[PDB]
Amino acid sequence: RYELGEILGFGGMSEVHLARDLRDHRDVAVKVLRADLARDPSFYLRFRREAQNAAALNHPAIVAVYDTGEAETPAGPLPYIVMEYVDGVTLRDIVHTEGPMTPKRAIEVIADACQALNFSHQNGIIHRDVKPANIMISATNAVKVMDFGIARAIGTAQYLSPEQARGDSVDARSDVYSLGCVLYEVLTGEPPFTGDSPVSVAYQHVREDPIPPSARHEGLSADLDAVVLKALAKNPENRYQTAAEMRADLVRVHNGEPPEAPKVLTD
Numbered sequence: 580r581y582e583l584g585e586i587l588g589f590g591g592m593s594e595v596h597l598a599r600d601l602r603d604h605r606d607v608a609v610k611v612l613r614a615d616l617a618r619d620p621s622f623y624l625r626f627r628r629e630a631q632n633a634a635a636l637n638h639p640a641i642v643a644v645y646d647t648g649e650a651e652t653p654a655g656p657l658p659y660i661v662m663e664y665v666d667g668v669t670l671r672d673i674v675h676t677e678g679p680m681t682p683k684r685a686i687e688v689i690a691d692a693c694q695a696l697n698f699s700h701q702n703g704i705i706h707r708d709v710k711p712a713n714i715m716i717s718a719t720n721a722v723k724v725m726d727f728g729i730a731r732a733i734g735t736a737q738y739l740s741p742e743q744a745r746g747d748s749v750d751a752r753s754d755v756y757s758l759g760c761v762l763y764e765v766l767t768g769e770p771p772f773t774g775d776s777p778v779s780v781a782y783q784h785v786r787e788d789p790i791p792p793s794a795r796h797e798g799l800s801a802d803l804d805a806v807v808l809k810a811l812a813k814n815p816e817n818r819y820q821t822a823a824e825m826r827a828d829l830v831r832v833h834n835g836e837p838p839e840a841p842k843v844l845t846d
């Protein structure tokens with residue numbers, strides 16, 4: 580049924596191919612688990628759980644899952660996920676090839692991502708892995724959020740929240756933080772915290788205030804700083820409490836109104 584074509588991308592756990600669905604005559608994206616990792620029950624299981632979770636989320640700003648299954652190969656079972664094809668590019672790719680977005684475009688993209696997260700949140704689903712590589716922009720300029728994570732027993736870590744680094748509890752305000760990180764990066768060209776290892780970035784997330792975006796790149800404003808720095812507050816109580824509160828402040832800033840977030844001052 581699915582004639583596989585060119586690879587679209589590589590992630591840490593998978594290869595994603597373009598394919599033609601021969602029945603419905605559409606282009607789909609097929610995510611196939613890396614053959615080496617499929618031998619490890621823990622990766623095989625993670626892959627299966629992620630697909631199931633993502634099939635429970637139907638929304639125009641979330642990449643849809645169409646089908647699941649396992650190919651019986653000479654080397655063994657190889658699981659895959661058939662999903663909505665996004666003809667486009669990730670924010671990671673965008674920052675890499677074109678650099679930071681204009682403030683207005685950044686705001687728009689991140690406000691549209693807030694709608695995917697608000698929808699998932701209200702279905703009791705936390706993304707857990709919000710990061711530039713998991714948000715695409717289509718060739719018609721649609722924002723698409725993908726690769727929602729899964730709840731676990733009690734890729735990169737550069738966008739995780741402080742609670743995640745500490746192994747503390749994780750709710751919608753973790754997504755808010757991580758979306759703040761992405762926003763930070765599409766405005767400035769850099770994630771808020773960088774370092775020569777993951778242990779060092781984790782420490783930064785937990786303990787060090789981010790440089791205000793306006794201090795790191797030209798063409799930004801104090802209002803925009805206020806919003807970004809509020810999503811990046813170390814304590815979830817000080818962040819936007821919902822994706823919708825965050826989007827509301829983004830829309831105010833887009834429209835030239837003062838945000839509700841606390842003022843950020845610099846000298």
Ligand SMILES: Nc1ncnc2c1ncn2[C@@H]1O[C@H](COP(=O)(O)OP(=O)(O)OP(O)(O)=S)[C@@H](O)[C@H]1O
Nearest residue numbers: 587588589590591592593595608663664665726734
């Ligand atoms: N539905 C899609 N349509 C077009 N391209 C896609 C699609 N899904 C993924 N891609 C591309 O494939 C790459 C890998 O997709 P992911 O699902 O995020 O892989 P992953 O192995 O789960 O990644 P991590 O974050 O390392 S775990 C992305 O960077 C995109 O370039």
Ligand SMILES: [Mn+2]
Nearest residue numbers: 590712713726
């Ligand atoms: Mn991913």
Ligand SMILES: [Mn+2]
Nearest residue numbers: 590592726734
């Ligand atoms: Mn993934």
